[PDB]
Design a protein around this ligand. Structure first.
Ligand SMILES: *[C@@H]1O[C@H](CO)[C@@H](O[C@@H]2O[C@H](CO)[C@@H](O)[C@H](O)[C@H]2NC(C)=O)[C@H](O)[C@H]1NC(C)=O
Ligand SMILES: *[C@@H]1O[C@H](CO)[C@@H](O[C@@H]2O[C@H](CO)[C@@H](O)[C@H](O)[C@H]2NC(C)=O)[C@H](O)[C@H]1NC(C)=O
Ligand SMILES: *[C@@H]1O[C@H](CO)[C@@H](O)[C@H](O)[C@H]1NC(C)=O
Ligand SMILES: *[C@@H]1O[C@H](CO)[C@@H](O)[C@H](O)[C@H]1NC(C)=O
Ligand SMILES: *[C@@H]1O[C@H](CO)[C@@H](O)[C@H](O)[C@H]1NC(C)=O
Ligand SMILES: *[C@@H]1O[C@H](CO)[C@@H](O)[C@H](O)[C@H]1NC(C)=O
Ligand SMILES: *[C@@H]1O[C@H](CO)[C@@H](O)[C@H](O)[C@H]1NC(C)=O
Ligand SMILES: *[C@@H]1O[C@H](CO)[C@@H](O)[C@H](O)[C@H]1NC(C)=O
Ligand SMILES: *[C@@H]1O[C@H](CO)[C@@H](O)[C@H](O)[C@H]1NC(C)=O
Lengths: 361, 254, 120, 99, 49, 50, 49
C-alpha cells in the first residue's frame, strides 16, 4: 500500500493495491477420437508388389495417417525421409498422400533419392529435387524369392531420355540404339527395353529383392485432410487449466454442464460472443467453461500513526480459492467478524464495514 | 453407356415464393435464448424460386448455374431424386463432383467423369440401370456414408463452396401439402463439410426413371440462389433456431 | 496473460493507473450519492403497532411484515418491474438497508411531520 | 414505461459493458484479434507491431469507455443531487416551490 | 465514397455506432430540454380581446 | 496511408463528440435551471432571494 | 565484434533477421544500436587451394 500510494504514511481507509489471478496448472489437449485410420495394411502388407517400371500409385485421402506405427516397426531397413522429419509427421496434416510401391535390388535402394543417377532413377522411377516425403525400403527375400527363380519383376533398361518426376513408363516398344529401323523385331542394335529381375533366396544382400514404398506428401491450396493422430491428454475438471479443444484454446475451469447441445454443435457462446460452453470431442459430454477467479486485492488499514495491522480483501473471490470471513464483496483475510453492529468506519461493501478497536469487521 | 431421352414435353419452368425457407445454421456454435446477427450467403425471404416438375411427360434436367450457392428444395415421394452433379465443364477436361444415393449408401466421388448428356438412375418394376458417366480416370476424393434420404417428404439442401470446402446443409420434413412449398420456418442443420477443393460453376439434378419406354415418377423440386446478406436468428432455450429476420427485406425487419 | 503484450504495454506509461483511478472515483461517487440521498437521518424511526392515523391508510407504503425483504407493496412492485477483467463492485448500502432508511423516513414524516428533519 | 429512467440507466451501463467486451473481437488493422494466434504465428519483430496495433486499439476503446462513464457519472451525480434536494425539501418539510 | 477506406474502417469495429448513438442522444436531449422548459401547461390560454 | 488518415479523422471525430457531450451536459444543466425558473418565477411567486 | 562470413550472409548481421548464422553463430538483439561494417577480403582471406 505504501508503494502504491507513494507515501510512507497511509491514512485510514481501504486502498486498491493489486490484482489476484489464479495461475493455470495443467494443459488439457482434447481432439477427436482416433478412428477411421488410413489403409496402410493394403500397401505395406500386400501379398504381391508391382514392378518398378509399373509401380503402383495408391492415393490416400480423408483419413488419419498414424506414422508412429510405421516408424517404430523393426521390419524396415530404410526409413529415409526427405524434406520433412519423421517426428512431426504424426502431428502435421497433408492434403493427399501418394503411396508408390515397387520392388528393386538391394544395391538400387540408394538411387531412390533426389539428385541420384542410375538405371532406376533415369529409366524407371524419377524423384524431383524438391521432393517432400519418405522412402521406406525393406528386405523381401522370404516372399519375393523362389528356388527356381522369381522373374515376375521387370525394369526399363534403356530409354532415349530420362524420365520426368512421378512418371510411369509402361511402353513395350523396341528401343532403337542404332540408325537402322527396328521394325518391331528384336535383332541387332534393337533391344526390348523391359528386362526381368532374377530373384533367388541364396543371393547376396545387394541382389536380394527389396520392397520400396515411397510416400509423397504435397500441400495444395485445398484444405488439408490427411492429418496425423492427435494425442489426447486425459480430462481434468474443477481446476483452472489451459484447454485446447479441436483447435479452440483458452484458460478456464471445466465443470459439468446441464446444457443439452444439438449433435452438430461443439462450442457455446453467450451474448458477448465468449466461449462459455463446449463439447468434449473424445466423449460426447457438455462442459461449462467458467473463467478463472480473478479479482482486486484491496488493503484495509487504519492510520500508520495508530497501528500497522492490515487486512486484505479479495473482491469477488470465494474464500476456498485463495481470521477468514466470507462476504458478498469477497473474501476478507485478517479481520475477525463480530456480531455487534457499529457505525461504518472503513467501507468494505455489501453492508460490511471495518474498524480498529485488532481489526474487526 | 448413355441414352438420349426423346419423349419429353416442352414447357417453361415455373416460379413460386420462397416464403421463409432456406435458413441454415451458419456455424457449429451452440447458442441459447439469444438473438444473433450473422452476415453470410443466405436465401432471401419471399424470393422468386424456380420450380421444376417430374410428372407423366415432364423430366426437368436443365443446365443450371451454381453462382455463389444453391438452395435445393424437394417435394418428394417414392424416392426419385438420387443425387447431384457439380463441376465447371462436366467432362473429362476438368474435375467434377458426384453425389449419388443408391439403394444401399450415399457415395461422393471427385473424379474427371465423362458425363452423359442425360445422366440418370433407374428402377425396374430393384435398381438395375445406372447411366451417369462413361469413364473415371483421375479420382482424388471418395466418401461413402449412410443414406441421407400426395407429396409426403420435404428435402431441403444448401450447397456452398467456400475456401475449398463444400458445405452441404440438410433438413428432412414430414409434410402433407399437395402441390407447393408449405409456409413455415425450419432451420437447416449442417449435413457434411467436404474438402473437395475444386472449381464449381454448374450443377445437375440426378433423377430416376421408372420402367415397367420409361415413366417419370411424381416429384417436384425448387432451385433458389444464395446472396450475401445479414440475418437475425433467434435461438431458444434448447439451442434450436425458431425464427429469423431478413435484415434487408423491408424497413420493419430492418 | 501475454507477457510480451504487458511488456509492450509498459512503454505507454501510467494510462492504466489513470483509468483505474477514474473508475474508482466513479465507484466511490455512487456510494456517496446513495449516502447523500438516503442517509439523511441518524435515528431509525419506527411506526406504532396500532395504525390509527385518523382514517389515513399507509399500508401500500409502509413495510410489509409478511414479506422477507421487509419492503412495501409499492417498493416490491418497483423491484419486480426493474430487470475479461471486468468486475462489478457491490453497493455499500444493500437493498434492505436502503428500504430500512426509507422506512425510517416514512415513520418520521408520519409520526412527527417535519419536526424530525430539523431536530428532535 | 413508468420506470423508464432507471431501466434507461441500466440499459446504458449494460450496453457500454457489452460494447467494451465486443471491442476485443476487432483486430484494429492487425492480422488477427487473438493475441495467442499472433504470438504463435509470427516472429517477435512483426508480432511486436501487431501487438502494438491491438494495444493502441484496445487502449483507445477503454479510454472512450471511461470518458462516457465519467460523463454519465456527472449526469447521475446531478440527478442524485436533485434527488437529495427533493428528499430534504419535499419529504422532510413542506415546500413552497411551485412544481 | 471510397470502398477500400470503408473496408479498412470495418476493422476498427463499432466506433461509428458509438459516435452516432451519442449524437442521437444529444439530439433527443435538446428536444427533451425544450419540452421541459416550455411545455409546462396543457391548456393553451388566450387573453381577452 | 489510408489507415493513417482513418486514425487521424477518427481521433478528430472522437474529440468533437466528447466536447459536444460536455457542452450538451452544460446546456442540459442550463435548461434544467431554466425549467426551474419557469416553474418557480412564472407559474408562482418565489421567496428565494435573487 | 570481428568475424569473416560469406557474401550473401551480410544481410543476416542485422536486428530482426531470420537466418543461419543469425541463429547458431552470431545473434543481434531487436533493440540493437551500433553499426555493421562489411568489406570484401578476397585478396587476403582466400587461397587458390
Ligand atoms: C444425346 O444427345 C446429346 C445432345 O444432342 C449428344 O451430344 C452430342 O453428341 C454429338 C456426337 O455426334 C456431338 O457431335 C455433339 O457436339 C454433342 N452435343 C453437345 C451439346 O455436346 C449425345 O451424344 C447423345 N447421346 C448419345 C448416346 O448419342
Ligand atoms: C388499508 O388498506 C389495505 C390495502 O388497501 C386494506 O387491506 C385490504 O382489506 C380488505 C378487507 O379487509 C381486503 O379485501 C383486501 O384484500 C386488503 N388489501 C390488501 C392489499 O391486503 C386495509 O383493510 C385498509 N385498512 C386498514 C385499517 O389497514
Ligand atoms: C505389416 O506386417 C508387419 C509384420 O508382421 C507388422 O508388424 C505390421 O504391423 C503390418 N502392418 C503395417 C501397416 O506395417
Ligand atoms: C472414443 O473412444 C473411447 C475408447 O477409446 C470410447 O470409450 C468412446 O465412447 C469414444 N467416443 C466416441 C465419441 O466415439
Ligand atoms: C418470377 O420470375 C418470373 C420470370 O423470371 C416472373 O414472370 C414472375 O412474375 C416472378 N415472380 C415473382 C413473385 O416475382
Ligand atoms: C451403391 O454404390 C456403391 C458404390 O458404387 C456400391 O458399392 C453398391 O453396391 C451400390 N449398391 C447398389 C444396390 O447398387
Ligand atoms: C488425368 O488423367 C490423364 C489420363 O487418364 C492423365 O494423362 C493425367 O496425367 C491425369 N492428371 C492428373 C492430375 O492426375
Ligand atoms: C472457375 O471456372 C470459371 C469458369 O470456367 C472461371 O471463370 C474461373 O476463373 C475459375 N476459377 C478458378 C479459381 O479456377
Ligand atoms: C426445450 O426442451 C424442454 C425439454 O428439455 C421442453 O420441455 C421445452 O418445451 C423445449 N422448448 C422448446 C421451445 O422447444
Amino acid at each position: 500500500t505504501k508503494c502504491t500510494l507513494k507515501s510512507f504514511t497511509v491514512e485510514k481507509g481501504i486502498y486498491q493495491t493489486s490484482n489476484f489471478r489464479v495461475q493455470p496448472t495443467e494443459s488439457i489437449v482434447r481432439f477427436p477420437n482416433i478412428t477411421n485410420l488410413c489403409p496402410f495394411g493394403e500397401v505395406f502388407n500386400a501379398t504381391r508388389f508391382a514392378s518398378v517400371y509399373a509401380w503402383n500409385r495408391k492415393r490416400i485421402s480423408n483419413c488419419v495417417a498414424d506414422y508412429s506405427v510405421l516408424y517404430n516397426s523393426a521390419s524396415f531397413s530404410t526409413f529415409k525421409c526427405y524434406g520433412v522429419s519423421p517426428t512431426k509427421l504424426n502431428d502435421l496434416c497433408f492434403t493427399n498422400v501418394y503411396a508408390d510401391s515397387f520392388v528393386i535390388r538391394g544395391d538400387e535402394v540408394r538411387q531412390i533419392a533426389p539428385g541420384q543417377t542410375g538405371k532406376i532413377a533415369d529409366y524407371n522411377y524419377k524423384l524431383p529435387d524438391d521432393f517432400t516425403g519418405c522412402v521406406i525400403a525393406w528386405n523381401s527375400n522370404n516372399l519375393d524369392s523362389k528356388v527356381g527363380g522369381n522373374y515376375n519383376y521387370r525394369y526399363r533398361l534403356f530409354r532415349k531420355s530420362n524420365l520426368k518426376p512421378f512418371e510411369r513408363d509402361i511402353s513395350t516398344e523396341i528401343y532403337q540404339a542404332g540408325s537402322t529401323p527396328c521394325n518391331g523385331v528384336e535383332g541387332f542394335n534393337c533391344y526390348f527395353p523391359l528386362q526381368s529381375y532374377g530373384f533367388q533366396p541364396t543371393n547376396g544382400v545387394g541382389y536380394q529383392p527389396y520392397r520400396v514404398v515411397v510416400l509423397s506428401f504435397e500441400l495444395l491450396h485445398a484444405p488439408a485432410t490427411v492429418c496425423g493422430p492427435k494425442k489426447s491428454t486425459n480430462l481434468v475438471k474443477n481446476k483452472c487449466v489451459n484447454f485446447n479443444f479441436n483447435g479452440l484454446t483458452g484458460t478456464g475451469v471445466l465443470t459439468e454442464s446441464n446444457k443439452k447441445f444439438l449433435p452438430f454443435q461443439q462450442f457455446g457462446r453467450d451474448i458477448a460472443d465468449t466461449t462459455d460452453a463446449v463439447r468434449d470431442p473424445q466423449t460426447l459430454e457438455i462442459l461449462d467453461i467458467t473463467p478463472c477467479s480473478f479479482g482486486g486485492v484491496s488493503v484495509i488499514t487504519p492510520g500508520t500513526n495508530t497501528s500497522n495491522q492490515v487486512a486484505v480483501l479479495y473482491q469477488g473471490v470465494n474464500c476456498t480459492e485463495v481470521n477468514v470471513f466470507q462476504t458478498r464483496a469477497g473474501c476478507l483475510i485478517g479481520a475477525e467478524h463480530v456480531n455487534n453492529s457499529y457505525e461504518c468506519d472503513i467501507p468494505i461493501g455489501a453492508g460490511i464495514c471495518a474498524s480498529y478497536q485488532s481489526i474487526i469487521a | 453407356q448413355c441414352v438420349n431421352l426423346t419423349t419429353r414435353t416442352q414447357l417453361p419452368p415455373a416460379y413460386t415464393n420462397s416464403f421463409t425457407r432456406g435458413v441454415y445454421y451458419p456455424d457449429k456454435v451452440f447458442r441459447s435464448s439469444v438473438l444473433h446477427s450473422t452476415q453470410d450467403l443466405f436465401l432471401p425471404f419471399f424470393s422468386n424460386v424456380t420450380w421444376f416438375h417430374a410428372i407423366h411427360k415432364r423430366f426437368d434436367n436443365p443446365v443450371l448455374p451454381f453462382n455463389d450457392g444453391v438452395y435445393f428444395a424437394s417435394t418428394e415421394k417414392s424416392n426419385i431424386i438420387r443425387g447431384w452433379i457439380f463441376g465447371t465443364t462436366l467432362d473429362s477436361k476438368t474435375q467434377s463432383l458426384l453425389i449419388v444415393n443408391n439403394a444401399t449408401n450415399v457415395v461422393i466421388k471427385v473424379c474427371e467423369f465423362q458425363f452423359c448428356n442425360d445422366p440418370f438412375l433407374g428402377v425396374y418394376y430393384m435398381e438395375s440401370e445406372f447411366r451417369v458417366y462413361s469413364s473415371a480416370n483421375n479420382c482424388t476424393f471418395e466418401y461413402v456414408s449412410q443414406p441421407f434420404l400426395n407429396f409426403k417428404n420435404l428435402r431441403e439442401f444448401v450447397f456452398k463452396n467456400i475456401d475449398g470446402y463444400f458445405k452441404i446443409y440438410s433438413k428432412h420434413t414430414p409434410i402433407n401439402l399437395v402441390r407447393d412449398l408449405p409456409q413455415g420456418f425450419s432451420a437447416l442443420e449442417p449435413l457434411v463439410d467436404l474438402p473437395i477443393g475444386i472449381n464449381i460453376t454448374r450443377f445437375q439434378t440426378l433423377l430416376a426413371l421408372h420402367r415397367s419406354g420409361w415413366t417419370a415418377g411424381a416429384a417436384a423440386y425448387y432451385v433458389g440462389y444464395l446472396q450475401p446478406r445479414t440475418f437475425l436468428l433467434k435461438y431458444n432455450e434448447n439451442g434450436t433456431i425458431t425464427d429469423a429476420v431478413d435484415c434487408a427485406l423491408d424497413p420493419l425487419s430492418e | 496473460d501475454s507477457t510480451e503484450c504487458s511488456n509492450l504495454l509498459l512503454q505507454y506509461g501510467s494510462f492504466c493507473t489513470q483509468l483505474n483511478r477514474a473508475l474508482t472515483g466513479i465507484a466511490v461517487e455512487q456510494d456517496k450519492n446513495t449516502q447523500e440521498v438516503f442517509a439523511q437521518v441518524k435515528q431509525i424511526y419506527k411506526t406504532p403497532p396500532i395504525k390509527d392515523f385518523g382514517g389515513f391508510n399507509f399500508s401500500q407504503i409502509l413495510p410489509d411484515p409478511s414479506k422477507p425483504s421487509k419492503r412495501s407493496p409499492i417498493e416490491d412492485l418497483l423491484f419486480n418491474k426493474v430487470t475479461n477483467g471486468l468486475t462489478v463492485l457491490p453497493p455499500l448500502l444493500t437493498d434492505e438497508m436502503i428500504a430500512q432508511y426509507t422506512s425510517a423516513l416514512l415513520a418520521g414524516t408520519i409520526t412527527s411531520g417535519w419536526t424530525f428533519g430539523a431536530g428532535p | 414505461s413508468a420506470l423508464g429512467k432507471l431501466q434507461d440507466v441500466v440499459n446504458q451501463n449494460a450496453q457500454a459493458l457489452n460494447t467494451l467486451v465486443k471491442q476485443l473481437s476487432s483486430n484494429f488493422g492487425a492480422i488477427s484479434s487473438v493475441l495467442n494466434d499472433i504470438l504463435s504465428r509470427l516472429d517477435p519483430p512483426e508480432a511486436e507491431v501487431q501487438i502494438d496495433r491491438l494495444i493502441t486499439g484496445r487502449l483507445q476503446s477503454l479510454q472512450t469507455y471511461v470518458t462516457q462513464q465519467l460523463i454519465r457519472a456527472a449526469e447521475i451525480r446531478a440527478s442524485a443531487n436533485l434527488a437529495a434536494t427533493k428528499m430534504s425539501e419535499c419529504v422532510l418539510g413542506q415546500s413552497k416551490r411551485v412544481d
